[PDB]
């Protein structure tokens, strides 16, 4: 009397970390081999990573990852001959929504702190994207899922609307660039912004770059209407 396990569908947002624990104990008997992939494929989608030890599927989507991703969770057993005998399979989907999909009053501007990095997210694995977000937490002091990580667009390494900003350690920018940002508050000004010494000083001195693993081009604080 086989048992079947349904897994609920999930949602993700371009530029925001994604994490879901997968109930592998319900799916795998002791001695089974768990595989997690794009449905019908061997690999996961390019934005996702499977952490076997923690039973966690995690990722950081790009704009090119928008749409629905079907994910297969399978259990197999080795035959005496080494063949992979399939045992059971459960499929769910994750829909990746555009960057703007994700408090401040309606239309009230959001004050955002952005760190500009000499990096190319399209050349980073999903684990590398997530690890960078983790390493920024010492400086942002926010939870992993409350930072945003997207590419530079139009090759613009600066924001002329910023009312506070400062330099990083980089002198030459080699890659397209990445923007790692988080919210400070609603419609703030220089005098309501919180203490940012813990961002500005390690950015300029190179301590932030040494911890993140990428050169820091600069940082800025600007008010944005969504």
Question: CATH fold of 1-102, please?
Answer: Immunoglobulin-like (2.60.40)
Burial tier of 51 (Cβ tally within 10 Å: 0-12, 13-18, 19+)? middle
The sheet carrying 178-186 orders its strands as 147-151, 178-186, 110-117, 216-224, 164-167
Separation CA 193–CA 97 (nearest Å): 30
| CB-based contacts of 161, cutoff 8 Å, min separation 6 | 222, 223
Residue pair 222/112 in contact (Cβ under 8 Å)? The answer is yes
Q: For the chain, where are the alpha helices, taking DSSP H only? A: 24-27, 126-140, 197-205, 207-212
Separation CA 83–CA 76 (nearest Å): 10
Which of 92, 46, 41 lies closest to 70 in space, CA to CA?
92
- Neighbour tally for 133: CB within 10 Å: 23
Separation CA 171–CA 11 (nearest Å): 39
The residue ranges of every structural domain in the chain are: 1-102, 103-226
Tokens linked to 117: 């990095």
Same fold, 1-102 and 103-226: no
**Which CATH code for domain 103-226?**
3.30.70.1040
Strands 18-21 vs 216-224: parallel, antiparallel or unpaired: unpaired
Which of 68, 42, 73, 47 lies closest to 58 in space, CA to CA?
47
């Amino acid at each position: 009397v086989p048992t079947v396990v349904g897994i609920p569908d999930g949602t993700a947002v371009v530029g925001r970390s994604f994490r879901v624990t997968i109930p592998t104990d319900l799916i795998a008997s002791s001695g089974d081999i768990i595989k997690v992939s794009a449905a019908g494929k061997e690999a996961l989608p390019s934005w996702l990573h499977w952490d076997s030890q923690s039973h966690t599927l995690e990722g950081l989507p790009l704009d090119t990852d928008k749409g629905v991703h079907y994910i297969s969770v399978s259990a197999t057993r080795l035959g005496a001959n080494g063949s992979h005998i399939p045992q059971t399979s459960s499929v769910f989907s994750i829909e990746v929504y555009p960057e703007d999909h994700s408090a401040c009053a309606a239309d009230e501007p959001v004050t955002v702190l952005t760190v500009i990095l000499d990096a190319d997210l399209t050349k980073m694995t999903p684990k590398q994207r997530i690890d960078l977000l983790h390493r920024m937490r010492s400086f942002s002091e926010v939870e992993l899922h409350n930072m945003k990580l997207v590419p530079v667009v139009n090759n613009r390494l600066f924001d002329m609307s910023a009312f506070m900003a400062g330099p990083g350690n980089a002198k030459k920018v080699v890659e397209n660039g990445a923007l790692l940002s988080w919210k400070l508050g609603c419609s703030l000004n220089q005098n309501s912004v919180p203490d940012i010494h813990g961002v500005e000083a390690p950015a300029r001195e190179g301590a932030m770059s040494a911890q993140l693993g990428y050169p820091v081009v600069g940082w800025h604080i600007a008010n944005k209407k969504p």
